[PDB]
Amino acid sequence: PIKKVSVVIPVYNEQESLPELIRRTTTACESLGKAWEILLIDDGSSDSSAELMVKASQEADSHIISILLNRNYGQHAAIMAGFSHVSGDLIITLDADLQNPPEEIPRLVAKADEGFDVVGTVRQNRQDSLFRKSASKIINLLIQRTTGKAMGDYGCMLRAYRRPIIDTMLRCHERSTFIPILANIFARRATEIPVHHAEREFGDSKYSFMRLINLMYDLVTCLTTTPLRLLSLLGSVIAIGGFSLSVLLIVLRLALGPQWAAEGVFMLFAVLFTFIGAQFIGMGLLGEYIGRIYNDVRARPRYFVQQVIYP
Amino acid sequence: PIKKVSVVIPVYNEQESLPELIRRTTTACESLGKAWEILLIDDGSSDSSAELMVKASQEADSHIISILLNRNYGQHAAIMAGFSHVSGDLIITLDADLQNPPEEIPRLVAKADEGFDVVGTVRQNRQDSLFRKSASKIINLLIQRTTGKAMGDYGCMLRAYRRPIIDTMLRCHERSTFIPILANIFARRATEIPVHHAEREFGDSKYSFMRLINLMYDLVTCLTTTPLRLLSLLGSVIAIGGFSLSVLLIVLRLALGPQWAAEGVFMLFAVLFTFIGAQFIGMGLLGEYIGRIYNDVRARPRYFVQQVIYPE
Amino acid sequence: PIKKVSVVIPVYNEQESLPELIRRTTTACESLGKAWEILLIDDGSSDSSAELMVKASQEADSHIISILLNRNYGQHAAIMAGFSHVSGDLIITLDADLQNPPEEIPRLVAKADEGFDVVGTVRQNRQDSLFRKSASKIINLLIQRTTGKAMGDYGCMLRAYRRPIIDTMLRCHERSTFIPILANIFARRATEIPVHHAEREFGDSKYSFMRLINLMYDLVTCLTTTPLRLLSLLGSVIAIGGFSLSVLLIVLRLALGPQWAAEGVFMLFAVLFTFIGAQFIGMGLLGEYIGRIYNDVRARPRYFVQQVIYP
Amino acid sequence: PIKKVSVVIPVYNEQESLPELIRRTTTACESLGKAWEILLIDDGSSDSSAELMVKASQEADSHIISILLNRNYGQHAAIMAGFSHVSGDLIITLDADLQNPPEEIPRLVAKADEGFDVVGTVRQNRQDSLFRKSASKIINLLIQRTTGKAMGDYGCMLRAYRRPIIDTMLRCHERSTFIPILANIFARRATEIPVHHAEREFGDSKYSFMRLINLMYDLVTCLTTTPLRLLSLLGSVIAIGGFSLSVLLIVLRLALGPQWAAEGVFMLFAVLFTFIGAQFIGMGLLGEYIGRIYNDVRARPRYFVQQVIYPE
Numbered sequence A, C: 001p002i003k004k005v006s007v008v009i010p011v012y013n014e015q016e017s018l019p020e021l022i023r024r025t026t027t028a029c030e031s032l033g034k035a036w037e038i039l040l041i042d043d044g045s046s047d048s049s050a051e052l053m054v055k056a057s058q059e060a061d062s063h064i065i066s067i068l069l070n071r072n073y074g075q076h077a078a079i080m081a082g083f084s085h086v087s088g089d090l091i092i093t094l095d096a097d098l099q100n101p102p103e104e105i106p107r108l109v110a111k112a113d114e115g116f117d118v119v120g121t122v123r124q125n126r127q128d129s130l131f132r133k134s135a136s137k138i139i140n141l142l143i144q145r146t147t148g149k150a151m152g153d154y155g156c157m158l159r160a161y162r163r164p165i166i167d168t169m170l171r172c173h174e175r176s177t178f179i180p181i182l183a184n185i186f187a188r189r190a191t192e193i194p195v196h197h198a199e200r201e202f203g204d205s206k207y208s209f210m211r212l213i214n215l216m217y218d219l220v221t222c223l224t225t226t227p228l229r230l231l232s233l234l235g236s237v238i239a240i241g242g243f244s245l246s247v248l249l250i251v252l253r254l255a256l257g258p259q260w261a262a263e264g265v266f267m268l269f270a271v272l273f274t275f276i277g278a279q280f281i282g283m284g285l286l287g288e289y290i291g292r293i294y295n296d297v298r299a300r301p302r303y304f305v306q307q308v309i310y311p
Numbered sequence B, D: 001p002i003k004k005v006s007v008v009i010p011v012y013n014e015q016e017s018l019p020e021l022i023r024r025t026t027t028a029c030e031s032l033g034k035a036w037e038i039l040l041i042d043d044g045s046s047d048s049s050a051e052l053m054v055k056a057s058q059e060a061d062s063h064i065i066s067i068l069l070n071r072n073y074g075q076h077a078a079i080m081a082g083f084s085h086v087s088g089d090l091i092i093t094l095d096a097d098l099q100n101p102p103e104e105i106p107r108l109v110a111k112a113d114e115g116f117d118v119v120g121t122v123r124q125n126r127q128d129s130l131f132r133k134s135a136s137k138i139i140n141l142l143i144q145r146t147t148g149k150a151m152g153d154y155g156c157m158l159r160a161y162r163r164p165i166i167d168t169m170l171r172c173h174e175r176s177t178f179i180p181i182l183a184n185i186f187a188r189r190a191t192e193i194p195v196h197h198a199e200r201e202f203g204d205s206k207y208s209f210m211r212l213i214n215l216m217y218d219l220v221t222c223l224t225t226t227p228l229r230l231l232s233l234l235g236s237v238i239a240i241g242g243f244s245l246s247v248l249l250i251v252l253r254l255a256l257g258p259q260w261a262a263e264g265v266f267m268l269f270a271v272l273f274t275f276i277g278a279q280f281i282g283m284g285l286l287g288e289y290i291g292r293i294y295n296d297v298r299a300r301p302r303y304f305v306q307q308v309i310y311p312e
């Protein structure tokens, strides 16, 4: 079933390209022909972006819904705040400074007619720092390993959500979540298509080094509790290494008395590493319990049954 | 009292031997004579296993109830997802590659007539990695120490649960639990019987080294919070040992100075070990609070009544 | 207001003195004159204690309510399990093997008529290990410091609770709690009286070294989250000690070159202590956050207003 | 819009200067001319402070509403307990020993006429321990960095809150919060004004060294979870430094061997530095997870709307 469509867009000091964005979005949604609404979310922009929001609000026959926040909460928080005041169904989330061509929105909607609950974009010809490209590849393989299904582009925010799934993510107790991955978790039928990607024209990058670390750290912590087990494994490796050094130095003690001058300090020094190993494995044990606590306080569903058959 | 019985079996990419498993389970249930249902749970198998589930569905007069998941959650999650859509009573959990002979299911049901709420299986002549056998023995002694009652083999998925106990597991908020251990905790009358063991045959084992570590960490976390207190005790031992060595070395220093050349650094090391021990103590204290958090978030019923009498 | 009284007693392999305990409790409650009920809780006793429970249940005109558990849960858990099936009001909790003379129960009830919500026993002439007496004194001063009121005897289990407060502790999300201290937390009007203490006659001590550590460790963790801050303080002390040693060795470097032969190892070893200190303060920071988590997951009330006055 | 106003004041053993405080507050409220109420909150004061509360109660035509607690919970808990039984709007929090002149209360109320939801006080010419002044400056720069908006002095209890915002704090499950910081987080329109500062005079300060450490740790935990990520960054720096030293020392060893006698222990120390760094990384990972635990157990509303418009 398809009804009133709503497109939710964040914005953060992007008033330079904003009027062109509004014109292109209006043209695309009018070309779609289905009844439409627009919800722009201001994340406490410094400049006169809220002023343009109010100006768009005053303009009659505009389906814009102006919402501005008291604080820069983070983008994902802004998409979620837009999710709070959704109307109709088939929520469309789009970039602010036209990094994603809005003209593609009907195609997603068209593919939304196929029946897929989640619609994603490949976003081909993506360009970034080569180290960041390698990080994207490794996190993509990690997320497809953990989830058991491959999803092309995580960083792309051009996505479509149905009303039931957006309600489901409204209900969840999670804070500081990653919208695409959480939506993919609550998916019955998902798909992805390629779309053209264009560089930022008037606007500049609003993701600093600290913001980059925060966003992919948030993504990795929202993904799984696996990395804590890695700490336990590293501790186990260090402990076995320390024990091997201890037994080798016992062999040396059985051998010539002075090894590398006085190896006496070495006799305790190696077991210091053993103690370090022990402390690391202790960290691992704590980590696993913390992981469990996290898995229980998120109230993540246990099984999401795809289908059931009776005789 | 015993009624309509249903058997819940997980599956993950076991279509190779699956039709023979279905035939043997149907034959065993028909030989039992009691009204029966079968529930296969697919954990998002890669191959055409869901296809065989649907094919069994269309088969006329089938008691199969095929349930398909959206992803590979893991085994215990699949058993509990099957537990969600159970009917009747005396739920029996089997394997997907005939490692446990299904022909033994009436015997459990027969012992279910005795009145035991949990009926476990002693796996006889079980063969595995000798290190893994030693790990099984140490976990068995740990669980019998903690529970105060010894049970044969926790690892066996062949087990029997009554409807009240399965409801008890259904109520809890605990994510990533171990079904047999939790059932043993929430038990009124438990027993165990020996059963023959067979290999995977055509099928292969799916539990890898990482999956083995994950599951045994899961079971130790689900059983008790004791190991954090064990860490605190180990830290206490290291701290007291370090302090004793420190005082002995300072006594030797006061007794004589020229006995060694660099014994000074020995006292320098003698304190840092105490620091390391003290650091472990911190771990212990931290751990205990997380223990409570765990005990507080899982919402475990503190007491369960074995048998209540109201005199009048 | 006063109605049907109930006395809840745990038991754990104490069938040797059990019949005499039942006779004395029945005599005392009959002497009280108020309508009475008795609830004995078996903590999975090995011997034929459940057999005596059933025998007492079969005996007509007995207000005993026989409840036995599937597992040795711990005593406090057994008192809580008795708390589950309470009837009437003024719950009386008593020791099993007559360490506390039951003949004093009406006096508590008599003082319960004064209006105090919580009734405690001093339990004078208490005898135990001198180290354990010192531990009792220090934990008593700690609990009176933390709570801001003094309460005589924590280890004494002869206590009286009203129905509202027992309902309050039933409602709480806490697991493995300490009944007397938790009751004192939810107190509007509390009091304590001295009572005679008698040694165990037929029964032996059922608290081993491991059980002793478990019980007072449970008490201290249920009391406050203060001990985690002690970790941070000791980390700060070790860090400042390491920094002092580092600056003294810099002074020595300014002084004669070789101090105690080669002090370069000392130079780096001081900063090793510095790193250890830093790690300990990290421990402290984690500890504080865990403390907060514990305080919020317990759902402990924030203020318990004693009284309000309007103009 | 501004209506009936109430002033909430904590107290803990401040009966020495209390009658003068009550007289000055009554005079200031009468000079204001708006309908007014006073709520004193006693945090289980040892001396006869509750007695003076009751005596003020019996006093005819008094707007005082005396509330007495069963124990010394602490300050912030007492302010929020007073927040429980508030009436009207524009709640003002004062001090119990006249350190902040009550005569300034109408000015806040006057600035409350401007429309600001939060009205804070700049405590001018404030004097304290120079180390504590430096601590105040560093916490101020930290909070203005995290919030993105600079506020004068967090430590001042003289502040103004509107009824919607006080309801917002009343709704949250957070135990042991810092009221001014939380109010600044849940703010629509905030401002600050300078006010004269006076000493405790007859009264003494109640915040001891342990209480100071407790409160500033409370405020840093209530503000942000940043310091755990700072610990992870410090660990990363130590790890990379240790690895660099290790590779430099092995390069020097390959270049020459007889340059030193015991350079071996140098590499031995270098690797354990890397281990220490890794341990700090472990702290970082754990603390981040605990951060999430903190965020989702406190149930903070992720977004708050400054101003919503529905075009039509």
Ligand SMILES: O=c1ccn([C@@H]2O[C@H](COP(=O)(O)OP(=O)(O)O)[C@@H](O)[C@H]2O)c(=O)[nH]1
Pocket (backbone or CB within 6 Å): A010, A011, A012, A014, A043, A072, A073, A074, A075, A076, A078, A095, A096, A097, A099, A200, A204, A205, A206, A207
């Ligand atoms: O704190 C922030 C930072 C960014 N954004 C949004 O994120 C967009 C960033 O767009 P883009 O993906 O083109 O930036 P890039 O990844 O190219 O730096 C901004 O326009 C905002 O709408 C936000 O809402 N809050």
Ligand SMILES: O=c1ccn([C@@H]2O[C@H](COP(=O)(O)OP(=O)(O)O)[C@@H](O)[C@H]2O)c(=O)[nH]1
Pocket (backbone or CB within 6 Å): B010, B011, B012, B014, B043, B072, B074, B075, B076, B078, B095, B096, B097, B099, B200, B204, B205, B206, B207
């Ligand atoms: O990711 C997995 C792996 C296995 N299984 C189930 O667990 C069984 C494990 O089989 P088996 O006992 O033969 O392997 P083992 O435990 O001996 O390694 C499989 O047949 C499946 O039914 C599952 O549900 N999910």
Ligand SMILES: O=c1ccn([C@@H]2O[C@H](COP(=O)(O)OP(=O)(O)O)[C@@H](O)[C@H]2O)c(=O)[nH]1
Pocket (backbone or CB within 6 Å): C010, C011, C012, C014, C043, C072, C073, C074, C075, C076, C078, C095, C096, C097, C099, C200, C204, C205, C206, C207
């Ligand atoms: O695991 C346990 C241990 C003890 N108890 C109860 O604690 C009592 C101990 O009595 P007492 O205080 O006289 O022992 P003591 O402190 O003298 O060793 C037993 O009789 C039981 O009722 C229990 O219920 N569960």
Ligand SMILES: O=c1ccn([C@@H]2O[C@H](COP(=O)(O)OP(=O)(O)O)[C@@H](O)[C@H]2O)c(=O)[nH]1
Pocket (backbone or CB within 6 Å): D010, D011, D012, D014, D043, D072, D074, D075, D076, D078, D095, D096, D097, D099, D200, D204, D205, D206, D207
């Ligand atoms: O345990 C305490 C200590 C203090 N206070 C309150 O906090 C005030 C602190 O006074 P002041 O600001 O003069 O002390 P400072 O913060 O300067 O140390 C007291 O008057 C009380 O109203 C409280 O509620 N509980």
